């Protein structure tokens, strides 16, 4: 409940640096500005390493074995992370700017090129224990007029060739004895050489240039050495090759141009297979897999990563991250669906299960400020600064109606009636709460009475009451349904920019400008308590600042708050560097999360060493599944979670209860005990040992035997396990039994079980019904063929 970890970063697929496929090619890794994200094409899952990188990734190195992954920052810091381990084995520091790092095919040593110097360093064994000084450098080459713009490695480690930007290209062997074989540097190349490629036969050397003219080097008699055999030229009106990737086995050449046109050629036949423009902006880094089936092209200017297969015209994954930042975060009733707003106004729907965007919405010309979902999967309402609010369908991907005001006002924020009849929005220009009906696109009423603008608006589902947020330091609770039209006002000490509505429908959580978060009642005007947030907020000193980070008033408030669906915890986040988790009854924070550690971003450091974009969280929500809360950052949408469960959180242990004892119960056939003895440890592998063990004939006997106290806990366990597990039929008999054993109790404690009901009924909708409908549709088609008369 308390220990969250950084599970996933979502959005911003590609920021900068090399994009390199894995040796297997199952997983493709794209480097973000401060972190490295690994995408598995086969499992459609995105995983991001918990480690921060202190500036933006400039180079990515992947070992052929895959044991060690190296990322080089602009500063030259080197971070080594084992893919299986997912931990930083060593953090050596390079002292100059790194362009590309490529491990050798053997993997004994990794070639590294910095400036005009080429370095080969023996790689420390992953299996070997950590050492104080693991990094060792085998050799340094300084014979370059200018720093090499690219590095290429042959199958053997004897020859390493780096193409300089001067025009000249040089070849370096690994071992000193093979120096006599190859030490020559090519000359006469026009413009600059983007990269140098080696074919399976070492006789032919392929070079590329900025101009776009390609020259092939073939060794032959004029006692005779290294003529140009044939030249190959690519014709582009204004396009110039930027990044070139070549695969020797398939003889496939990937060319990157300033125009952004994508073209493919074969070195042996010099034939152009296809020319496609990924985007107007030029491709920065292109990489190829061993098979060569998947090619990844990423443009830094548009910040979009695209993967294409040459053999079949289908794209495994194509997506573009938000250009600036996500203004609002919207969570649908189903845990998987995620909606993120952007400054551009483009709306993209992310997926909780796999970090990809199902679709985009370009309906809002102006930037989108708030995106919210009504209590259905039918539609989502988005608030924009354009002055119009447009509802969207998710079955059909279309506007219903675009709600607008009278005198064309900006709209910050938004509130949707849970029974989806009424959409309310609020401004900075007007400070009148406009109210639209969902059916008739007219505005029903202009609810007014605030001095100063409305910051936020929310509706409690249980009581259907909307509470306004004002800069006048007074919180007014509206009651708008059914012949009442009565507004209750509660005074607040400082401008309230944060409004949170509890699931209960009885409490309202606020975030004022003094820092302090207050929790009010609704049926009474009084407050339960307030929790003090000015001290435990980390604030950055910007680069252009003139004050200490201690006494600036930039970031010590909270520009968002969201209650957990338990109603017991608040996650807050503002224009600061930090996110919080306050407990609501005990009134004490639980754990404080630093969003990012980048010198590249501004608001990170409390103390600088002796404009840049500010780093701040915009909108935070806790998911219905409730494992993690997503906070929408500058770097992109973060996701925190507890899906690890590497943690010993026991409950009611006796001395008699050990993991072995639970296993003994299965032999004893005491299913009721061995489940409770496994719930006492609260460890998932003992539970899966006893959940998968007990048979069908004693599931309901066990369900009746299960205590009321463990009913909420057992339901949550089934919800997280059955989504990725092959047993449909065995899991549903449990959910039949838990519901069948105590239908009334679960219904009576509707507030007590919220996360369990939502998690269980995502498993039923997403994977269980689609198996049903395919079984249903297939059966009807067979019935139609036999029933219908034969043709001719």
């Amino acid at each position: 409940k308390s220990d969250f970890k950084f599970s996933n970063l979502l959005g911003t697929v590609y920021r900068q640096g090399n994009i390199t496929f894995s040796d297997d090619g199952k997983q493709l890794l794209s480097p973000v500005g401060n972190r490295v994200s690994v995408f598995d094409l086969i499992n459609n899952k995105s995983f991001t390493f918990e480690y921060e990188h202190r500036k933006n990734i400039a180079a990515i190195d992947l070992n052929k074995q895959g044991t060690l992954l190296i990322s080089i920052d602009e500063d030259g810091r080197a971070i080594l992370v084992n893919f299986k381990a997912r931990n930083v084995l060593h953090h050596f520091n390079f002292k100059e700017k790194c362009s590309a790092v490529k491990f050798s095919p053997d993997g004994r040593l990794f070639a590294l090129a910095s400036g005009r110097f080429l370095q080969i360093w023996k790689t420390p064994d992953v299996n070997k224990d950590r050492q104080f000084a693991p990094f060792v450098r085998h050799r340094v080459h300084a014979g370059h007029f200018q720093d090499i713009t690219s590095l290429t490695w042959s199958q053997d480690s004897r020859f390493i060739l780096t193409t300089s930007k001067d025009l000249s290209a040089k070849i370096w062997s690994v071992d000193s004895e093979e120096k006599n074989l190859a030490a020559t540097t090519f000359n006469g190349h026009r413009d600059y050489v983007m990269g140098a490629f080696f074919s399976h036969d070492q006789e032919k050397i392929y070079t590329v240039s900025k101009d776009g003219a390609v020259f092939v080097w073939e060794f032959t008699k004029r006692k005779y050495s290294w003529r140009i055999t044939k030249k190959h030229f690519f014709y582009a009106n204004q396009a110039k090759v930027k990044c070139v990737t070549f695969h020797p086995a398939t003889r496939l050449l990937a060319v990157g141009f300033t125009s952004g046109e994508f073209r493919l050629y074969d070195l042996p036949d010099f034939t152009l297979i296809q020319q496609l423009s990924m985007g107007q902006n030029p491709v920065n880094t292109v990489s190829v897999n061993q098979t060569g089936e998947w090619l990844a092209f990423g443009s830094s200017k548009l910040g979009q990563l695209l993967v294409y297969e040459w053999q079949s015209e289908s794209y495994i994954l194509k997506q573009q991250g938000h250009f600036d930042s996500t203004n609002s975060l919207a969570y649908s009733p189903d845990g998987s669906r995620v909606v993120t707003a952007s400054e551009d106004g483009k709306i993209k729907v992310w997926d909780i299960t796999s970090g990809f965007c199902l679709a985009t919405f370009e309906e809002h010309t102006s930037s989108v400020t708030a995106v919210q979902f009504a209590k259905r999967g039918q539609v989502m309402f988005s608030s924009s600064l354009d002055g119009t609010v447009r509802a969207w369908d998710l079955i059909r991907y279309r506007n219903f109606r675009t709600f607008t005001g009278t005198e064309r006002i900006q709209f910050n924020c938004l509130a949707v009636d849970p029974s989806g009849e009424v959409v309310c929005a609020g401004s900075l220009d007007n400070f009148d709460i406009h109210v639209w009906s969902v059916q008739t696109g007219q505005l029903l009423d202009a609810l007014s009475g605030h001095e100063g603008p409305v910051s936020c608006l929310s509706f409690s589902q249980e009581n259907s009451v909307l509470a306004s947020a004002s800069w006048d330091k007074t919180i007014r609770i509206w009651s708008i349904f059914g012949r009442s039209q009565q507004v209750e006002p509660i005074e607040v000490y400082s401008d309230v920019l944060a409004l949170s509505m509890r699931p209960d429908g009885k409490e309202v959580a606020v975030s004022t400008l003094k820092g302090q978060i207050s929790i009010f009642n609704i049926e009474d005007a009084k407050q339960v308590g307030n929790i003090d947030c000015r001290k435990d907020i980390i604030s950055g000193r910007f680069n252009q600042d003139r004050f200490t980070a201690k006494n600036s008033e930039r970031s010590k408030f909270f520009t968002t708050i969201h209650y957990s669906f338990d109603g017991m915890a608040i996650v807050a986040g503002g224009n600061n560097n930090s996110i919080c988790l306050y407990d609501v009854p005990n009134e004490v924070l639980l754990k404080r999360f630093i969003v990012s550690r980048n010198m590249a971003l501004n608001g990170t450091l409390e103390f600088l060493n002796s404009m840049r974009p500010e780093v701040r969280v915009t909108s935070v929500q806790f998911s219905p599944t409730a494992n993690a809360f997503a906070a929408a950052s500058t770097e992109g949408l973060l996701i925190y979670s507890t899906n690890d469960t590497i943690l010993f959180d026991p409950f009611d242990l006796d001395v008699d209860v050990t993991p072995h004892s639970t296993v003994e119960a299965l032999r004893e056939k005491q299913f009721l005990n061995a489940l409770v003895m496994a719930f006492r440890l609260n460890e998932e592998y003992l539970i899966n040992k006893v959940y998968e063990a007990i048979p069908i004939k004693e599931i309901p006997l066990v369900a009746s035997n299960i205590p009321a106290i463990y009913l909420p806990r057992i339901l949550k366990f089934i919800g997280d396990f059955a989504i990725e597990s092959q047993h449909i039929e065995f899991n549903l008999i449990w959910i039949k039994a838990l519901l069948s054993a105590s239908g009334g109790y679960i219904n009576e404690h509707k507030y007590l079980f919220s996360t369990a009901m939502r998690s269980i009924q995502r498993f039923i909708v997403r994977v269980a019904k689609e198996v049903v409908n395919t079984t249903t549709d297939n059966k009807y088609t067979y019935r139609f063929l036999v029933s219908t008369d034969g043709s001719m």
Binding site: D129, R130, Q131, F132, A133, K535, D536
Partner: protein, 427 residues
């Protein structure tokens, strides 16, 4: 006793212990090795970072150290390790049961001297080879020839001659033949420490009485002699900057500087290391540079420099007294109670029977500082009750620290041994 979970990383909080540190030079940089018990360390001399600690603990204490350019020669009980980057790359075992007291390197040869007056010679097997490996021969010294071996020195420009200094007199052994080419005359005092000179044919000598004796080998005579009141000379070094300077390090904590040209002392340093733990065990002017490096046995290592002279025309007469430069510290006595400071494992509080708490650094080993003990002047206005000769706080047996509100008020509570109160500390 091999564990399955844990494996030792390095020992932290220890700089020196009393074994004489030995300097080495790589490229233009200067690297200084010390030892800690059974595991030696390597410090840079330009900023005193920690560069290398050894990969395994030695089976016993390192008795003597020396370092030729890349290779650190470490000598524990029966064996001599020839270490590069803290990695044991060649273990050289001496064929006695005696324990090795002193060690020396020149040329193709290694020269190790056990305690029972026996000197072992190890040759480079090839001139291509970097570490000497093959056992050449066994040189002995009977007690009619000289006393117990004080040290082994190899002077400049002597083909295979090894200046063996003893408690009685000074020897010379041509290690190619194995023969005593020259023996000196017997000295009236017990010799404690010898060191060569940047001049030709001269080794410097140090007695248990306070006498430094310059001794020529070509003439076999005493050229100069320097008397010191009431001191046991423990370390000698010459400044090679171009200005003649001798540094005599006592065992009563004093470091004493001479000017051999002017025949005068210049400035005497008092208590730069503790008298009780051994005084100045080793002091060395770095080559051609005005930096002397002092390392006592009281778990510290300090550098002192000479500023340039304030006189324009005079120069060598008006000499600036030496000046404190960077240093590293540790813990004199063993630590009683420690704790970790923060979540990223970046500081460790350590309070010991030395009565002085230390905030050591796991991260960078030059970042460790003693927490000050300097009482805040009271809010109330009445004066603080305490002895005017300030003594340290009694030793700390219970510590508590919660890091949540740091930098705004106190967050460390320590309970001292046998005190009815218990103080607080800001982190």
């Amino acid at each position: 006793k091999n564990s399955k979970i844990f494996s030792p990383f390095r020992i932290i909080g220890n700089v020196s212990n009393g074994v004489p540190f030995a300097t080495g030079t790589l490229g233009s940089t200067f690297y200084i090795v010390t030892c800690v018990g059974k595991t030696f360390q390597i410090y840079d001399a330009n900023t005193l970072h920690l560069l290398f600690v050894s990969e395994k603990e030695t089976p016993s204490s390192i008795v003597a150290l020396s370092a030729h350019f890349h290779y650190v020669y470490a000598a524990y009980e029966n064996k001599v390790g020839i270490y590069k980057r803290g990695i044991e790359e060649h273990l050289l075992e001496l064929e006695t049961d005696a324990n090795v007291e002193h060690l020396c390197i020149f040329g193709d040869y290694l020269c190790a001297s056990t305690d029972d007056n026996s000197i072992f010679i190890y040759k480079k097997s090839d001139p291509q080879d970097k570490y000497p490996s093959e056992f050449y021969t066994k040189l002995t010294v009977t007690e009619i020839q000289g006393g117990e071996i004080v040290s082994l020195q190899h002077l400049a420009t002597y083909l295979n001659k090894l200046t063996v200094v003893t408690k009685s007199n000074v020897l010379l052994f041509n290690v190619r033949t194995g023969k005593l080419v020259f023996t000196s005359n017997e000295f009236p005092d017990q010799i404690t420490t010898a060191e060569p000179a940047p001049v030709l044919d001269i080794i410097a000598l140090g007695t248990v009485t306070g006498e430094v004796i310059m001794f020529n080998m070509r003439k076999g005579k005493r050229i100069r002699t320097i008397k010191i009141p009431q001191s046991r000379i423990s370390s000698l070094s010459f400044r090679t900057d171009g200005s003649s300077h001798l540094s005599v390090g006592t065992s009563s904590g004093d470091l004493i500087f001479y000017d051999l040209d002017r025949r005068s002392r210049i400035h005497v340093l008092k208590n730069i290391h503790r008298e009780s733990y051994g005084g100045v065990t080793q002091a060395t002017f770095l080559n051609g540079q005005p930096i002397i490096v002092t390392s006592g046995g009281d778990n510290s290592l300090k550098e002192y420099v000479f500023d340039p002279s304030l006189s324009q025309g005079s120069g060598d007469v008006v000499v600036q007294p030496p000046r404190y430069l960077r240093s590293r510290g540790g813990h004199s006595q063993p630590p009683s109670y420690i704790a970790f400071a923060d979540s990223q494992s970046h500081f460790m509080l350590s309070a010991s029977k030395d009565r002085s708490l230390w905030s050591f650094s796991l991260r960078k080993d030059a970042q460790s500082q003693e927490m000050s003990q300097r009482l805040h002047k009271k809010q109330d206005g009445g004066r603080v009750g305490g002895s005017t000769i300030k003594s340290k706080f009694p030793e700390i047996v219970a510590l508590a620290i919660e890091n949540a509100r740091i930098g705004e008020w106190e967050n460390i509570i320590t309970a001292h041994k046998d005190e009815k109160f218990a103080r607080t500390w800001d982190m």
